[model samples]
Target: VASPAEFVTRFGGNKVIEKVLIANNGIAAVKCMRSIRRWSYEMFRNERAIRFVVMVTPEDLKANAEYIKMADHYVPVPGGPNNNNYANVELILDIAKRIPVQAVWAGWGHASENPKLPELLLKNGIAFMGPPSQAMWALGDKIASSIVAQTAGIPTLPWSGSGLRVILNVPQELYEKGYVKDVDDGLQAAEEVGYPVMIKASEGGGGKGIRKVNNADDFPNLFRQVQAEVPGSPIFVMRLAKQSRHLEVQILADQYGNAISLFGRDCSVQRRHQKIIEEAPATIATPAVFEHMEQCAVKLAKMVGYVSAGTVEYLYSQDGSFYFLELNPRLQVEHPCTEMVADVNLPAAQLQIAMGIPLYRIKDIRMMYGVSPWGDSPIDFEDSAHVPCPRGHVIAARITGTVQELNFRSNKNVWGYFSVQFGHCFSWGENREEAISNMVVALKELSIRGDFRTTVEYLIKLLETESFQMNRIDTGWLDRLI
Candidate 1:
């Protein structure tokens, strides 16, 4: 990792985002507020309160949720923005201005990837606690990001971004940009790449809008189905990486072209392409290969002039090769796994970066072995002389109301879930085996009543599975087994 070229983002400004509006709910809100209160209390000694406002919807006000009680101010908002209130960027911006907060932390899902949020927030002189609009536009789109990744010396799957939906695509700009241009065009491209092609929507992740085409005969219908499913999204084709591990690198960068890789997470344990378990320091790939992956990730970030937190995702196969998947330009749901192993507070650093503080100067992001900075060990991981050294193995189970419940024809209303995540059960170990043992103990010890039945029993059974214990599990193993 050499010094990046000077001049990427501005740094050392007096601007500090003291008050923020959290525009999301559930785990995203709860996790964010946890960091918010701890940092505010630690840094300001509770004298100057860092106000955190939460937007509560009708459902949450009626039901339960610990997030609402913890907020400094909680206000009722009319739900039904794409069927989710917090997703409406216009409404969120209006609320932020009315609340008069200094910044907005959308967390991950709702408005995190929507470049429009940052654009308007910039116009109003309010800070966005994420990447710039330009960065998001470049890296957020699957097709566009694939091009960028390939250009940055990162390998990408053989694919085509040729066809566009009438109302969904970017028109001729993207229609003529890639290999395939029509159904017949994609069929022919599939021949070149061979069968088992993947028809993917250009703007989605976390296991939606992706279908595998086994042959050219099923390509057209499946392709149209994906178009309808993602409505208003362009379609792309790729040679599916059948036996692959979903590995992603956690990245932190400042406005001043200073960037570092906090290492990688192996999200290979998934059900229906939805990650169920994620662990730090992916060990499937050799260390040398991981080193290259980290280098390529850092390069991609600097190439896009990315600021704050982002993730560069890839598919590493059993054949000693990897390919770029997509770039998520926001904090991830599984970020805590990286935080536990890397020993750094990501959200706090994100707030520091939002205020234009250089990474090295954000002293609170120190990897000081779980000890507070209140007494000693002020060294931080951001300085050029120091880097994040991931220690111990940490595993996070995405606790939910419907891991196996989705398989049922009649069960508790799946609609009751506001989000897929009920919470995450994270356990650490000095090594992989200990981590597994601790995770088992934690899962067994915690009980969830059957009203919202959990996958606790299944998860415990999974830990003892031969495939998982032997590390022979691929991304699709769970789906295949069930």
Candidate 2:
């Protein structure tokens, strides 16, 4: 599972996925978790197999227990609603020692800043699932991640030190080099190539710190607001390609350095730069695009000598061309879609890979779809699209506490008004209505309930919009819509 730090983009809550797989393994499961006022059904669904040891307020536990009924055991965290700092760690370690379980998987909460936590887990004999000290540092920091990608000559958005120029206040030195005091230099550079620029925070996530500027004047004000909100954040500016569709490739690597790239997912339906829906084999991506993406993704991970689950994101343009985007250095939230297409237990694979297990002989592994349904391969356009794929073919809803319709709301402090399109990718056949009809059954079966409003209406509108469906919207599109 990805760490709480990643989830904080949507909520201040923490989650653990390794044990989710362990539960599927039918082994004794132990989960260390904390939720504030609200509970996440996604967390509960993922934790159904484990014995949950919650570190939460009495009110939260009471409210959450009503929705969750599967935990094998329950150990309420100390200090119920207040003053449970420092002691929480002690309780977690003690439980790990007492459990005597097959494996102890742990993750950090939003409040956790102790980089040494991994070391502590190691000393206590817990096998860390993510990067070790050197690696975490290498991947956790935006500047660090960018440097690694750049050093490897990987195509990525151009970035620089925040100290190079302050937001709102432009550096004359940079200005002389044609670097205007635009909201983001990257976006400014991109504007030269065309209109519509992408402004992202180098240090932000949970899909925050990202904005698609349709008008040039919108930058300074937005940048000021964002920079003020997220201190210590590095700014990024990039060209907002026209007809850009979001695509991502899920990947896993074993400790010995063997790796594989699963097929890709399309997550283009979005609002305010946040994904509202995602699907596999992207409705627009043919088999050929999938194969090429996989090849590059696997090659790059092996080049970095990485182990564990990660994602490679890219931008697929309307003209059938693709460009490499940033790499998500951890398991992606929407990995389930790839798992669906590949017919594999991804959560299980994450643990096995992290635990030093190999899936297949490196050289013997093949990329044929018949060999591995999830493998990348060339796809003929005539075989798919089925054209102008019908709308309402698929719809996924996150169980959030936020109100629906006019606007979504959230109860959490750090994670209010969030969007999750991680695993909701859909496809429709020749009968558009029938293809969409299938969605109601699927969404009804999916179980996740919580309090938060993601921009679902806007997303639906995006899907139904002629420009968006045609892959004709640009970065500047949003500003015009507003």
Candidate 3:
């Protein structure tokens, strides 16, 4: 039997799905859409068949053979598959009109980030396989998302005002209209928030436009750098927690006000604030904290009337307090870890939700470890059980090339060389140590034949580090080490 057929029966109650569209480019297209296409083919082929129509750039046709072979109908897209091009919502809409696509499965990247695309698809009478446009906008911008989280009473980190001023621990009246006009203004904002604060671009991620100002002396230069990286962008000054664990919860919600928290992921293994390795069921979470995290995630999702799959990220400090960092409105790259341990096809479930299937129908499906889904748990907001023991440990290592090489390959409108695309390897075991050990072997076996250097060696060393093994590290730990 095909995996998709079994998954659909178990989750979607065997609804007949006719055809779907996979709209994305590059490795994300390969990693996420590949699974969806495979499942769709299997589910539709038995007594029914589903056909997948893929749209890719001319460069993808030349460089990526896997993506070419995976699609049942391959269509070429003009202006390629970069974030800038995904903004051409009209092009995507035209393609969907040409094909008999029931829904558009926007794999992560610009397709997911483009707010107009979702609104356009719905307006044109086509199903968008993701969150509502309002939900996406609310969660896409980090500053806006943080405000929403705070308003929902979700525990968010100490952050300055969403605008370009510092509101954390400082009086709101101090800054006029939330913009810092001069260096003195900036210094006062930082001083009020306290030194050792993080200066971040309101529109930044993947460690792009952030700087740590340990003292007032370096605040001016660091702040200038952030502005240079993203000039005119809203600046957010936040209190930097010492050695905090980066934990996030995966949540699935329906338009019917029902929601379920799949679990948590530990993403502290990072450099330059970019996660390099991640594992499911964060090790640092005590039973009480885990339950609290789960409730917070569900609360935030429902408060915003969120539907579809999303992740609520938090920074758990050493003192055992966790605060919301932001909400990723789209499927995260690290979703594989949650899927492996939770034993659920998240993309399949997402498609099911897009088809109007409620959460209660599929909430009883047993996880890989035999633990019932969160829906089956008794509601006790006041009681915290022992930390649910994980059935196994799963670790993922993200392989990326060095900065110089990635930059060179990224400049082309059409990729001629394969230097920019990164790969990932995952290992599983009964325990964390065993998982780490398995990852070591997997990295050794993963061959990079070109002049590309991966973070594999760095990850291996990090896993071997005493701090990592003992779980004594935090978000800033890797940055300090490197």
Candidate 4:
């Protein structure tokens, strides 16, 4: 890693940017290094400009340092981004003050969604390679975005109440605050909402503090169970759709009011309500359904004045009805699947858009068949009114660590590993079954060497399952199986 003065002399004193800060230190930083480093290097070299610094986070002395070696510099903070020390923000800001850079790329997770990070970067005159903070705040808050969705005329699940106080998502008159103080109060609310209800913690996510009440007799106990989990925390109850599919659309927008919908993804396969496998261009997609989803996604993105990359999720039931879920105001883990099928570079595109590039029209983007050898040709938007048809299937498996001897609260070093450090994605299969089979082979090729558990075996089983193969799965489908 070269200093600012050294960079100037090396590049013949061009005075162009010599460094950039990457405000992340997880799997995202690794992905960012892989996705952009070569391109940045190539672009700088082509323009006779100097290569820029990619400053990352604190080096993990215990864990493998192979990933951090890719970056130019590492800020030696007290703990990683997940720690309570709150050093990630301060260290990155300090580096920006100390280093000369063009932009701060918050790869993913943590500060990527932190509203203050975006504002601080902008205040310090650094480009935040993502959406504006206001846009993130508007779309990141699940409850606030639901209202925005309704205002934009997008269909959302029948939900009411505010904050943690939720009720059955039904007609306004029928809706009542679901949190109860005692057993009788819980029973009454359950009867009003009807059986087969879902009780959830207001502050809870990632499948925690969620209980399904099938009848009044079990409602009180289930309510107490969730309350005990997050005691004194607000609870909300909503109508639980026993069977439904999870669908999401990737949206790209620019500051110039241009927006486009890449396509939809099926993320129904899950365990404990978390996605394990995601596929692009959902197998169950119909023309009308796709059109409605695309229109709604675009409409919502524009409504919030969203810029850069984002995802608008939906709940698609077998009855041909779809409802809005929530808008992820940052890049998602499964964006690679969309990139594979759509032939787009989402990460790079986000940075370009952040730098004031306009997004291409949806009609101009082609989702062609395998090995079509197509380029970004000019489009006649007026004449081209057809929606892009997906050519093939792309599936991605998110390989996450299975914690071992988890003692983080006690400040003990945690250890976990899997068969592989990261997951794999395969594309260009004419059909989904073939794509899945190919991915299975790829997974099998990797040796299971780590002392931690991975979802590889579970994913292979899921892919081979008849229900998943036949697309007869929903959000709750995997929960029942596992």
Per-model TM against the reference? 0.85, 0.60, 0.80, 0.75
Candidate number with greatest TM-score: 1
lDDT winner: 1
Predicted structure 2: lDDT? 0.45
Q: Between prediction 1 and prediction 3, which has the larger lDDT? A: 1
Off by over 4 Å in 4: 1-19, 41-59, 80-90, 162-195, 199-236, 361-387, 400-428, 447-455
Colliding residue pairs in candidate 1? 9-255, 168-232
The list of candidate 2 runs beyond 4 A from truth reads 1-54, 66-69, 78-120, 131-140, 157-199, 211-224, 361-435, 440-482
- Scanning candidate 3 in windows of ten residues, the lowest lDDT window is 407-416
lDDT per residue as tens, model 4, 1-482: 13434433432322234455776555566665555554455444332132334443344435544445656665555654454323256656767777756667776565676677777777887766777877776576555566566666677653333222220122223223424446676566556666677776643434567898888878777888988885665565566765788888988887777677777888887777777778887767676887788788878777767888888888887778888877887788678777767777676666555555444422124332222223334343224436456657877665552111111221111111222244444433657876776666655543243532364577778878898888888877877885
lDDT tens readout by residue for model 3, 1-482: 25444555655433434566677755555555545655456554542245567776766666664655766787777754364344367777878777857677776666676668778888877777788877776666666667666666667655565333221122335333344555566687777778788887766655667898899999889989988996766676778776778898888876567777777899988777778778887878886787888888887777667788888889887677888888887788778787777666787677767766666544422333234553434333223223334558888777761111121121211111132546555666778888877776655544343533355678778888998888788777877885
| RMSD to truth, every model | 7.4, 11.6, 7.2, 8.5
lDDT of 2 by residue, 140-258 (tens): 44444444444444455333322232201223354233322445564455556455766666556566666666776776776776577656666656566655777887776766656
Ranking by TM-score: 1, 3, 4, 2
Better of 2 and 3 by TM-score: 3
Whichever of 3 and 4 has more lDDT, that candidate is 3
